């Protein structure tokens, strides 16, 4: 969690749930990464319970979020002369999206009651629309490479966290403990109970 600060300055660094200041103390069991690109007016749409463009038709976000998002400007790489047509969105759809659901199709939307079904025209349009990154365009249309670093609560043995030093433990003494992100004060004594190996 230290080699990501030399890429580009961060326009926003909001973090629902886990606070960024303490990413080293916690230790999670699985890390989810969702990478895509957004325009300047589209930055606020990466948030729980939003609508319109992304959090309703393209990338639905769950109501409860304990992860973090990292946003930075990529004008030097993705933005080209007369824009880039590789990045798209979906604007027309019959229904909404479940959280963390990806959709892809080559079909065209049926806006009206006319059974077009493969033929463009009135009340039948392509759901995918391209957007460009021109230098003449303002900040509202700029390449913003973002990632969704989703997390979850401690319900499994932790796997990925920072390289904190693990010192040797002691028994039958008043010593603080830090076991996979949880901390407390007490004594550590051997117990004769039994724990299933899972």
């Amino acid at each position: 969690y230290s080699v990501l600060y030399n890429l580009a300055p961060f326009f926003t660094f909001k973090c629902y749930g886990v606070s960024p200041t303490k990413l080293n103390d916690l230790c999670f069991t699985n890390v989810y990464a969702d990478s895509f690109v957004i325009r300047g007016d589209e930055v606020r749409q990466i948030a729980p319970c939003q609508t319109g463009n992304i959090a309703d038709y393209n990338y639905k976000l769950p109501d409860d979020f304990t992860g973090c998002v990292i946003a930075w400007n990529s004008n030097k790489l993705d933005s080209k002369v007369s824009g880039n047509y590789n990045y798209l969105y979906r604007l027309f759809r019959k229904s909404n999206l479940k959280p963390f659901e990806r959709d892809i199709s080559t079909e065209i939307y049926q806006a009206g009651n006319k059974p077009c079904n493969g033929v463009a025209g009135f009340n039948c349009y392509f759901p995918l629309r391209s957007y460009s990154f021109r230098p003449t365009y303002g900040v509202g249309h700029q390449p913003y490479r973002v990632v969704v670093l989703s997390f979850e609560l401690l319900h499994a043995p932790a796997t990925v966290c920072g390289p904190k030093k693990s010192t040797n433990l002691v028994k039958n003494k008043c010593v603080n403990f830090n076991f996979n992100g949880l901390k407390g004060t007490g004594v550590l004594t051997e117990s004769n109970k039994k724990f299933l190996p899972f």
Partner: antibody, heavy 126, light 109 residues
Framework: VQLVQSGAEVKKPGASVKVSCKAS????????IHWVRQAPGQGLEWMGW????????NYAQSFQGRVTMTRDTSITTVYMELSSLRSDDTAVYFC????????????????????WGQGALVTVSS | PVLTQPPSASGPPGQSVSISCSGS????????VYWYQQLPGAAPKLLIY???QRPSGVPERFFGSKSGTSASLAISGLRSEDEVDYYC???????????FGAGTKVTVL
């Protein structure tokens, strides 16, 4: 802009041919160049495009393994080479250019060719 | 998958000339259509792009539309500079490659 191409060449069935198109007057690092062939008796037939900065290329179903793509951004030229050409390849070569970047497959429906290179005529007969 | 076109077209001066270009359901409608014109003994040039959009430097006598399946266009009047063939172009999702028509060489009567 200016898009010059190699002159007319002559060839023999079963041999290899090589043509090149030079890009000038615009930034080469982010503008795609498409390759199309025009034979007498029919219309244009699409062949493929080359990424000027990247290396991923896409080819047609009829020319999946027949064509080869080579690029060199130091001199801003695109090298087009054909191997084991058939006898019905007597046609002209156009180094068609499209605005913007279209490395992905899905951007072709909003893609058009603005400026075209000169016709590189090749004569192939037994 | 194939884009048919008549080999040639004829028309008297000062009269519209009908040009037909038809394709499949995935060739037309699923993807946009494009039109180009080629000078004799030269390189082709862009004429019509983005369906009904007309570029700068190209006059208004070219009226074109893709309709639903068959793309048809007419030219208001005829001149000596309009003796060029026209190529209709569109994208095919199944073929994953561009297709072009045969061409209609308009002859002035």
């Amino acid at each position: 802009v200016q898009l010059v191409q190699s002159g007319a060449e002559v060839k023999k069935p079963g041999a290899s041919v090589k043509v090149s198109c030079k890009a000038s007057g615009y930034i080469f690092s982010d503008y795609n160049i498409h390759w199309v062939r025009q034979a007498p008796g029919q219309g244009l037939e699409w062949m493929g495009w080359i990424s000027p900065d990247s290396d991923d290329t896409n080819y047609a179903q009829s020319f999946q393994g027949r064509v080869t793509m080579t690029r060199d951004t130091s001199i801003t030229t695109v090298y087009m080479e054909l191997s084991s050409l058939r006898s019905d390849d007597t046609a002209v070569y156009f180094c068609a250019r499209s605005v913007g970047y279209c490395s992905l497959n899905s951007c072709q429906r909003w893609m058009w060719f603005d400026t075209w290179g000169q016709g590189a005529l090749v004569t192939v007969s037994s | 998958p194939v884009l048919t076109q008549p080999p040639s077209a004829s028309g008297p001066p000062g009269q519209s000339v009908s040009i037909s270009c038809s394709g499949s359901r995935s060739n037309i409608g699923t993807n946009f259509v494009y039109w180009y014109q080629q000078l004799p003994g030269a390189a082709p040039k862009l004429l019509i792009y983005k369906n009904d959009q007309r570029p700068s430097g190209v006059p208004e006598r070219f009226f074109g539309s893709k309709s639903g399946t068959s793309a048809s266009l007419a030219i208001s009047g005829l001149r000596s500079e309009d003796e060029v063939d026209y190529y209709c172009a569109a994208w095919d999702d199944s073929l994953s490659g561009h297709v072009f028509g045969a061409g209609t060489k308009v002859t002035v009567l």
